Design a protein around this ligand. Structure first.
Ligand SMILES: CCCCCCCCCCCCCCCCCC(=O)OC[C@H](CO[C@@H]1O[C@H](CO[C@H]2O[C@H](CO)[C@H](O)[C@H](O)[C@H]2O)[C@H](O)[C@H](O)[C@H]1O)OC(=O)CCCCCCCCCCCCCCCCC
Ligand code: CLA
Ligand code: CLA
Ligand code: CLA
Ligand code: CLA
Ligand code: CLA
Ligand code: CLA
Ligand SMILES: CCCCCCCCCCCCCCCCCC(=O)OC[C@H](CO[C@@H]1O[C@H](CO)[C@H](O)[C@H](O)[C@H]1O)OC(=O)CCCCCCCCCCCCCCCCC
Ligand SMILES: CC1=C(/C=C/C(C)=C/C=C/C(C)=C/C=C/C=C(C)/C=C/C=C(C)/C=C/C2=C(C)CCCC2(C)C)C(C)(C)CCC1
Ligand SMILES: CC1=C(/C=C/C(C)=C/C=C/C(C)=C/C=C/C=C(C)/C=C/C=C(C)/C=C/C2=C(C)CCCC2(C)C)C(C)(C)CCC1
Ligand SMILES: CCCCCCCCCCCCO[C@@H]1O[C@H](CO)[C@@H](O[C@H]2O[C@H](CO)[C@@H](O)[C@H](O)[C@H]2O)[C@H](O)[C@H]1O
Ligand code: OEC
Ligand SMILES: [Ca+2]
Ligand SMILES: [Cl-]
Ligand SMILES: [Fe+2]
Lengths: 62, 37, 34, 335, 82, 340, 28, 35, 447
């Protein structure tokens, strides 16, 4: 539960760091954002579940 | 202080506040890269 | 050839770092008050 | 009559008036005449004012023992604080002159008018088809009168703490300020002196560079000034020769060649610097004072090793400890 | 608009430049650092170390009081373990 | 002849023009700047003023400084190899040799620089009004950092090189010389203050009275580096001020000469005032005022008020500000109002 | 203790997201 | 063009450039002295 | 698309004056930075927050904003649960990512203009209706917000009422002043000493009540603009352009910035001295309290004590007859405060209560506030400029007040600047005098 929480919360940080540097260069070079429109979508969708994971999961650790 | 669990992020949260300033800064990194058009 | 805009943003952060070290030194050094 | 009011508005706004009485002017002209007329009478004949609310009248007018340098119009009483004290608030004028009523009548009308004076510096520029912004340069000196005549008093809780209207009275405002805020050790004041020193500096630079690079069109025994006619087409000085000299004094890229960039800098510098100085007084009006490095550097045992910052504190204490002799009854000066 | 000197822009960009200064700059830095950190600076400038303003007990200042025999007077101030 | 060859070389148009003048300017100008930067970080003012004055001791950019020599030194030039330091360097440092160093060097450096302007002016063939102007700053430096202390007991009372170390110079002058009440200091400020006005006011008048010579908003590019027409409506400017202030220029040649005059005259006056403070011939009091204040205890002006502020400044500062006087002012002798 | 570790990365991040664009050359 | 290296400009640039860094290094070190 | 042949680099953002879409990214990306801050700062504050210690002694300025809305605090501003703080902080911080996404998106991928990618969102500056309407939408969003407060106070928990009968405490307002005569009365109040205008609000009923009125009055105007166009004068009076609109909103913020500076400096109610520090006047008052209290214990008769000037060491009279504290503190006789009120009578400070009803909690309140006046230095050294280092402190009320006067000011310059530009832009000369047709040259000589 705890490590499980620190995983979700900690991974959620690296995804953000990755997501943050990503989306930019994404819409940036139109070399796609059609193939990456796929990547970004998964990052975005993923992120939300994560927040919800850490959200609900918070009430069990603290 | 930060709820017991998140304590591991104490240090992280220590720098968050200053970020906004960075953006005003970046805008300059950019223009420089794009040769002040 | 090293792109100018990089020479700057690098030499730049480099100064905020040293000048920032000075500001930290103000709450620890001899110039402290403690 | 094309319509009286229609006409009135055409006159007021007329750009053919010797002095452009504008829309802002309609407020300016009266407020400024009141401020000026009340001042001149005050400064010459007003009687002593109990500035510190402790029944210890300070006479500051010529007819009551003052000379131009010492004389001044004294601030409203401290008994009054920030309360509005219009003549119709006094049992009599005798009472109004004693509590420093004239001071408010003056500062309020002046600050009011001096603002409209800004509003006007815009209007005329509009009626004449010229770019605005001149009025924005004048926002600095105005923003100061405001800081020194209103912000500081609001902040400090009384108009009696506003800068007096007189030479020596001003030095008083300064000397005490320094003691209570240690302004010389505040970033904003420093930026202020940079702007003022700098201004005067640059004012001299430009002035000389230009005047020294004027195209000859005058006799050896004829005022070099005549070499210019009001309403000329071409320039009267070699801005390329100017830049040529100045570029060699220091070094080329550190010299202006664009008259427009030169003049922007020329305006930008002082105005920006004074803006900060005005924000300094407006900021130290809420007690966020200058750097306090008292007893910072201390030795290996704990002894206090003085710096010039400390020698400054002593001079400040002297001021603190002696200003307003009889006004304090308690330990801390929180007012 | 020009003189003999090689346009700074070109130099600050030349990989040769950095190849040289990446060595030179930090060089100078680490030197001065050591200048302070080795206590050498204190002796080059007679500047007191945190434990050398006063003698343990004394609370008086080592004020130089006469020009000509000044150097001599200063030396004696260092004496009282000041 | 080598001379003309030596010349030739010097007056050669480089990035940083050297010139004959440079032979004096650069050596000094660099030494002055160097000595300051050195003391600011390394030399102390302990043996001199009982003060920490360098980064090495803990001072920050505001509190650091190259403090004057002891009062014992008197007006001694304090040469590295003179009777004081005796060739020794470290001692020199501790006796404030670095002050007369920066002082005297920078002094020559201001001579060299003005000469430069004069030399470069001549070459480029322009009038020397940039040199005339610079007389003003020389006068200030000369009267304040040299003439002044030359009239006092010693270099110790000259302004020490440093930010804060200069603020006390200000406070001192108020407290001891009541300098703010001096006719010459006033003219001084009227000029610097009034000069920083012409600066700002003229600048804005130009930028907002410009003709359109481009299609852009950023009108900076729209400028002809190569003369021709006036870039701003001198005729419009005249009418503006003539209607808002009542008075307005109308002879750029005069408007610009005026700008040289105002601040250079101001600084010249502020100098004379100080040349007088050297002999302590100050503008301290108004006798008619003092006489009435003596006989009549209810007479109070913003002037009398100030003088009391001075008494406090002198009494509470003198002790740690003039160490050589071994002042001891018992708590009971210290002037103070009620409560504070 | 030394969360300077943090700053550092989030610091070279700003310039990075434009640099990679200087490489993928496009839309600056 | 065929620009030179050691020039007058270079000398100057170093007279200020070299010492500076040496000081910035010195000062940076002081930030750790104590008592 | 846009470069130097638009505007100069340093005026870059003005190149977006006519690209609705991108100009949306900016506003959506920016609004992100504010949430980011609010969020990221709260956690910074909490990360340093020490429960058993005054908030004002910790450089807090957001946690005290939450505390006022009745969150994590209880009796006398005692901090009970730090959760609401952590929550408010993280939530914002998250939403910053959501907004930031949209911003970045609308500014570098999505449509560069809107008018075509949807005529509902695309807009025309000179479109008096689109403008009056979008304005109308926002006038409603803000209106709902004003009620979002009225709700928290009346239904969801309350607010921190320092005037609490039993002594400062979270209280549920269930009786908002709705009487217009009173509510709007405030606007007709002098802004000078005593009558303080808006800043004189001194009880939560009016606060809550007044917000009820604003919420409605606000949404009402939101609908009205949705359903209308500026009349005639409204049109022959204003300038209709992208800049001109900005300017108007610039002067508006400026003014609100000055009003805010005075609120945090003077107001006791919506800015509880329990979370922020004691007010300027409140602290000077406390010194008098402290010493009248002390010396009275040493056997001094405060009522008849004569000070150096012959005015009254401890108690004197104001200009209209009321009994107030003496000393330089005579200037703050308009100060009212929970701790000091119980000593006031119908004629001001009552010599009998002062003589035997002073309570210990008051003595220490006066002492606390006396030693925490809003005096300090830039480097945060609490006290008078001549003080010594040791007590690292600068009242939150000082920080807030200064920061906002600077911002408020520069914005008034911003106003003048953007308004001056708009008027020249409209008539059309903001780029120079027509070399050919130089207006001045067609006017008679006044000479
Ligand atoms: C060029 C550049 C131009 C720059 C111009 C800047 C102008 C800034 C002025 C701020 C606007 C004033 C609005 C305001 O918030 O106005 C309110 C302020 C503050 O008013 C205060 O109002 C009262 C505060 O009560 C509160 O404060 C406490 C006492 O300290 C008590 O506890 C009490 O319970 C609590 O309710 C008191 O009477 C105070 O002494 C004070 O007068 O007005 C004042 O002082 C201002 C005095 C009036 C002048 C303003 C004219 C504006 C045109
Ligand atoms: C605008 C309102 C505002 C206010 C009122 C405060 C108030 C406060 N902050 Mg916060 N802060 C803010 C915005 C604000 N902050 C923002 C936007 C950030 C993100 C960068 C932060 C980040 C922050 C941090 C990281 C910390 C604080 C802390 C604090 C507290 C201590 C203050 C201090 O030490 O100041 C000292 C600061 C200064 C003296 C800086 C003055 C700078 C001015 C504005 C610059 C003037 C220059 C001018 C712009 C030049 C341009 C001119 C040119 C164009 C010509 C104080 C309660 C501290 C805390 O909580 O600890 C107790 C703390 O550690 N703040
Ligand atoms: C060319 C520019 C220049 C100038 C004008 C000065 C000027 C000065 N220096 Mg500086 N100096 C310079 C460059 C310069 N310096 C440089 C580049 C350095 C770094 C090496 C220094 C390092 C330096 C130090 C370390 C010191 C000075 C000091 C001084 C001051 C007094 C020294 C003195 O008494 O000289 C006397 C002048 C001469 C030697 C000129 C003699 C010229 C004639 C024509 C030659 C005749 C010679 C012949 C042998 C004599 C026959 C006579 C017979 C009876 C014996 C003086 C203001 C001192 C100071 O600041 O004191 C507080 C000091 O301690 N300087
Ligand atoms: C309500 C907010 C607001 C908005 C939306 C705008 C919007 C606009 N402004 Mg206005 N402005 C405002 C407030 C605002 N302004 C205020 C309050 C002032 C008074 C100072 C001004 C003064 C102003 C001027 C003087 C000009 C504009 C211009 C413009 C236009 C182009 C933008 C630009 O030039 O970016 C480019 C931005 C920059 C180069 C950034 C400068 C950075 C500032 C000065 C530093 C602030 C210091 C910071 C806090 C310190 C942090 C530390 C650092 C080391 C990290 C744009 C329409 C320009 C124009 O063309 O007019 C139509 C123009 O020339 N504005
Ligand atoms: C408040 C902040 C701010 C904002 C929101 C904007 C916004 C905008 N600017 Mg302005 N600008 C600013 C400050 C700002 N600016 C300042 C201070 C200056 C003066 C230095 C300028 C100078 C300026 C110029 C000179 C120009 C603009 C232009 C533009 C527009 C196009 C963007 C672009 O060119 O992308 C280019 C794209 C990139 C190279 C990528 C940069 C990286 C992205 C945007 C950041 C990613 C952020 C974060 C790390 C990731 C979040 C991800 C997460 C949500 C998952 C856009 C509306 C342009 C215009 O007029 O529009 C046509 C233009 O020419 N701006
Ligand atoms: C500032 C507010 C704002 C505004 C005015 C717009 C406006 C627009 N967006 Mg952008 N957007 C925003 C924020 C905003 N967006 C943010 C923060 C993000 C990141 C998540 C995006 C992401 C985004 C994408 C990915 C796309 C757009 C597109 C568009 C355009 C088409 C309309 C549309 O999407 O309808 C959508 C449908 C609706 C009208 C329903 C919205 C209802 C939601 C569920 C409720 C929102 C609730 C709100 C918070 C509370 C208000 C309630 C209160 C009154 C009681 C339109 C110009 C599209 C485009 O580019 O096409 C041209 C597109 O593909 N936007
Ligand atoms: C803040 C958002 C907001 C904004 C930006 C607007 C904007 C506008 N409104 Mg709307 N309005 C709003 C909210 C808003 N309104 C709300 C909430 C309501 C419901 C009460 C209304 C009701 C309303 C009506 C009934 C009308 C407008 C009209 C207008 C338009 C012209 C207004 C004008 O000329 O004023 C300038 C007005 C003057 C010449 C009078 C100056 C005198 C002021 C009031 C007093 C002096 C001010 C002083 C400095 C402040 C101190 C405080 C005071 C209490 C002592 C303008 C587009 C008009 C229109 O064209 O309709 C479509 C119109 O007839 N509005
Ligand atoms: C090549 C170009 C370079 C040419 C050099 C020209 C000289 C430039 C001026 C030098 C500035 C000195 C600042 C310095 O070294 O600070 C060095 C100091 C050292 O900092 C100190 O460190 C410790 C000492 O043991 C203690 O902690 C002290 O209390 C203090 O903090 O830095 C500061 O604290 C101040 C911050 C920097 C402020 C500088 C702004 C100056 C603006 C004025 C510009 C001139 C006009
Ligand atoms: C990490 C993280 C996060 C986030 C983040 C973000 C969102 C960020 C951003 C960031 C950014 C946004 C950054 C930036 C940076 C920047 C910089 C670092 C810059 C710099 C610059 C410079 C240095 C410059 C310079 C110059 C000069 C001086 C001159 C002129 C030119 C130029 C401009 C070049 C989170 C919370 C999730 C969690 C944890 C982690
Ligand atoms: C257009 C543009 C621009 C701008 C930009 C912007 C304005 C941006 C923004 C952005 C943003 C606005 C962003 C945001 C982001 C965010 C994020 C990314 C977040 C995250 C978060 C998290 C992750 C959380 C969580 C947590 C918790 C709860 C606790 C513990 C810790 C943590 C932190 C983990 C510029 C100038 C550059 C340039 C030009 C263009
Ligand atoms: C133009 C004029 C420029 C003059 C520049 C002179 C600079 C050098 O000045 C010279 O410094 C050296 C030390 O380094 C001094 O030398 C001194 O210290 C050395 C030891 O270091 C002793 O052996 C020597 O007996 C003593 O006099 C000289 O006495 C002084 O005259
Ligand atoms: Mn005129 Ca500001 Mn020193 Mn309390 Mn009175
Ligand atoms: Ca932490
Ligand atoms: Cl006084
Ligand atoms: Fe000019």
């Amino acid at each position: 539960m705890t490590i499980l929480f620190q995983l979700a919360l900690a991974a959620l940080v690296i995804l953000s760091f990755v997501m943050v540097i990503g989306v930019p260069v994404a819409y940036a070079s139109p070399q796609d954002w059609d193939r990456s429109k796929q990547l970004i979508f998964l990052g975005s969708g993923l992120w939300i579940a994560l927040v919800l994971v850490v959200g609900v999961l918070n009430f069990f650790v603290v | 202080k930060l709820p017991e669990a998140y304590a591991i992020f104490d240090p992280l949260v220590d720098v968050l506040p200053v970020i906004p300033v960075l953006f005003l800064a970046l805008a300059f990194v950019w223009q420089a890269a794009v040769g002040f058009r | 050839r090293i792109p100018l805009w990089i020479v700057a943003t690098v030499a730049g952060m480099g100064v905020i770092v040293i000048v920032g070290l000075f500001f930290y030194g103000a709450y620890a050094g001899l110039g402290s008050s403690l | 009559s094309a319509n009286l009011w229609e006409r009135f508005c055409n006159w007021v706004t007329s750009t053919d008036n010797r002095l452009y009485v504008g829309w802002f002017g309609v407020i300016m002209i009266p407020t400024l005449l009141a401020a000026t007329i009340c001042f001149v009478i005050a400064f010459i004949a007003a009687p002593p004012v109990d500035i510190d609310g402790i029944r210890e009248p300070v006479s500051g007018s010529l007819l009551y023992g003052n000379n131009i340098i010492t004389g001044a119009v004294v601030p409203s009483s401290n008994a009054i604080g920030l309360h509005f004290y219009p003549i119709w608030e006094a049992a009599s004028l005798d009472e109004w002159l004693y509590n420093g009523g004239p001071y408010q009548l003056i500062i309020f009308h002046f600050l009011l008018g001096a603002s409209c004076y800004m509003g006007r510096q815009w209007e005329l520029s509009y009626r004449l088809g010229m770019r605005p912004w001149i009025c924005v340069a004048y926002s600095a000196p105005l923003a100061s009168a405001f800081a020194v005549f209103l912000i500081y008093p609001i902040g400090q809780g009384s108009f009696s703490d506003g800068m007096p209207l007189g030479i020596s009275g001003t030095f008083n405002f300064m000397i005490v300020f320094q003691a209570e805020h240690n302004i010389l050790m505040h970033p904003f004041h420093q930026l202020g002196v940079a702007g003022v020193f700098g201004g005067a500096l640059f004012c001299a630079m430009h002035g000389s560079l230009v005047t020294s690079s004027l195209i000859r069109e005058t006799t050896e025994t004829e005022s070099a000034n005549y070499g210019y006619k009001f309403g000329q087409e071409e320039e009267t000085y070699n801005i390329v020769a100017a830049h040529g000299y100045f570029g060699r004094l220091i070094f080329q890229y550190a010299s202006f060649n664009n008259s427009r960039s030169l003049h922007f800098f020329l305006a930008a510098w002082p105005v920006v610097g004074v803006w900060f100085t005005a924000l300094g007084i407006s900021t130290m009006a809420f007690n966020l004072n200058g750097f306090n490095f008292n007893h910072s550097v201390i030795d290996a045992k704990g002894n206090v090793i003085n710096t010039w910052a400390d020698i400054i504190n002593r001079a400040n204490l002297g001021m603190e400890v002696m200003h307003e002799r009889n006004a304090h009854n308690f330990p801390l000066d929180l007012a | 608009g020009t003189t003999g000197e090689r346009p700074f822009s070109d130099i600050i960009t030349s990989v040769r430049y950095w190849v040289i200064h990446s060595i030179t700059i930090p060089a100078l830095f680490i030197a001065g650092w050591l200048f302070v950190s080795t206590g050498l600076a204190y002796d080059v400038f007679g500047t007191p170390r945190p434990d050398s303003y006063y003698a343990q007990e004394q609370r008086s200042i080592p004020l130089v009081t006469d020009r000509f025999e000044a150097k001599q007077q200063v030396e004696t101030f260092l004496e009282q373990l000041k | 002849g080598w001379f003309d060859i030596l010349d030739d070389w010097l007056k050669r148009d480089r990035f940083v023009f050297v010139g004959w003048s440079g032979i004096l300017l650069f050596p000094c100008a660099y030494l002055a700047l160097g000595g300051w930067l050195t003391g600011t970080t390394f030399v102390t003012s302990w043996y001199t003023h009982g003060l920490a004055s360098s980064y090495l001791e803990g001072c920050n950019f505001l509190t650091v400084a190259v403090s004057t020599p002891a009062n014992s030194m008197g007006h001694s030039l304090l040469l590295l190899w003179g009777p004081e330091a005796q060739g020794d360097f470290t001692r020199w440092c501790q006796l404030g040799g670095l002050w007369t160093f920066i002082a005297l060097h920078g002094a020559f450096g201001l001579i060299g620089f003005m000469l430069r302007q004069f030399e470069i002016a001549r070459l480029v063939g322009v009038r020397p009004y940039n040199a005339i102007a610079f007389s003003a700053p020389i006068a200030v430096f000369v009267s304040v950092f040299l003439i002044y202390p030359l009239g006092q007991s010693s270099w110790f009372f000259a302004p020490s090189f440093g930010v804060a170390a200069i603020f006390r110079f200000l406070l001192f002058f108020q407290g001891f010389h009541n300098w703010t009440l001096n006719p010459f200091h006033m003219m001084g400020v009227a000029g610097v203050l009034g000069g920083a006005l012409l600066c700002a006011i003229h600048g804005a008048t130009v930028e907002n009275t410009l003709f359109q010579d481009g299609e852009g908003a950023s009108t900076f590019r729209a400028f002809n580096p190569t003369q021709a027409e006036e870039t701003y409506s001198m005729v419009t400017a005249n009418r503006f001020w003539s209607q808002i202030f009542g008075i307005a220029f109308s002879n750029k040649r005069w408007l610009h000469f005026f700008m040289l005059f105002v601040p250079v005259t101001g600084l010249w006056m502020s100098a004379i005032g100080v040349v007088g403070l050297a002999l302590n011939l100050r503008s301290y009091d108004f006798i008619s005022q003092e006489i009435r204040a003596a006989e009549d205890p209810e007479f109070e002006t913003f002037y009398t008020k100030n003088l009391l502020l001075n008494e406090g400044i002198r009494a509470w500062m003198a002790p740690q500000d003039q160490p050589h006087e071994n002042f001891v002012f018992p708590e009971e002798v210290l002037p103070r109002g009620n409560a504070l | 203790i030394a969360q300077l570790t943090m700053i550092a990365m989030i610091g070279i991040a700003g310039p990075m997201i434009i640099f990679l664009l200087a490489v993928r050359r496009g839309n600056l | 063009v065929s620009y030179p290296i050691f020039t007058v400009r270079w000398v100057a640039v170093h007279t200020l450039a070299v010492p500076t860094i040496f000081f910035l290094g010195a000062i940076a070190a002081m930030q750790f002295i104590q008592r | 698309d846009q470069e130097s042949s638009g505007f100069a680099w340093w005026a870059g953002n003005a190149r977006l004056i006519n690209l609705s879409g991108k100009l949306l990214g900016a506003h959506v990306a920016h609004a992100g930075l504010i949430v980011f801050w609010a969020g990221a700062m709260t956690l910074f504050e909490l990360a340093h927050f020490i429960p058993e210690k005054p908030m004002y002694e910790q450089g807090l300025i957001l946690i005290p904003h939450i505390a006022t809305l009745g969150w994590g605090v209880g009796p006398g501003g005692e901090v009970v649960d730090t959760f609401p703080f952590f929550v408010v902080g993280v939530v914002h911080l998250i939403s910053s990512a959501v907004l930031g996404f949209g911003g970045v998106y609308h500014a570098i991928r999505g449509p560069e203009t809107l008018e075509e990618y949807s005529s509902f969102f695309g807009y025309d500056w000179k479109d008096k209706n689109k403008m009056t309407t979008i304005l109308g939408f926002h006038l409603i969003v803000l209106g709902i917000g004003a009620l979002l407060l009225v709700a928290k106070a009346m239904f969801f928990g309350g607010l921190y009422d320092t005037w609490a009968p039993g002594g400062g405490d979270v209280r549920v307002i269930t009786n908002p002043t709705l009487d217009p005569r009173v509510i709007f009365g405030y606007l007709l109040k002098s802004p000078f000493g005593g009558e303080g205008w808006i800043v004189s609000v001194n009880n939560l009923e009016d606060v809550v009540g007044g917000h009820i009125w604003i919420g409605l009055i606000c949404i009402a105007g939101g609908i009205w603009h949705i359903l209308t166009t500026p009349f005639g004068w409204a049109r022959r009076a204003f300038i209709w352009s992208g800049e001109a609109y900005l300017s108007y909103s610039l002067g508006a913020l400026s003014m609100m910035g000055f009003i805010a500076t005075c609120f945090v400096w003077f107001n006791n109610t919506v800015y509880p001295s329990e979370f922020y520090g004691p007010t300027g006047p409140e602290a000077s008052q406390a010194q008098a309290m402290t010493f009248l209290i002390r010396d009275q214990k040493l056997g001094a008769n405060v009522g008849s004590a004569q000070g150096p000037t012959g005015l009254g060491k401890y108690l004197m009279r104001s200009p209209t007859g009321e009994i107030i504290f003496g000393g330089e503190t005579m200037r703050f006789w308009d100060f009212r405060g929970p701790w000091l009120e119980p000593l006031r009578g119908p004629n001001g400070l009552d010599l009998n209560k002062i003589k035997n009803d002073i309570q210990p909690w008051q003595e220490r309140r006066a002492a606390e506030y006396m030693t925490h006046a809003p005096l300090g230095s830039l480097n945060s050294v609490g006290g008078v400029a001549t003080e010594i280092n040791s007590v690292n402190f600068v009242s939150p009320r000082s920080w807030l007040a200064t920061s906002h006067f600077v911002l408020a000011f520069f914005f008034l310059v911003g106003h003048l600047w953007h308004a001056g530009r708009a008027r020249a832009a409209a008539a059309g000369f903001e780029k120079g005098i027509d070399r050919e047709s130089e207006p001045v040259l067609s006017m008679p000589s006044l000479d």
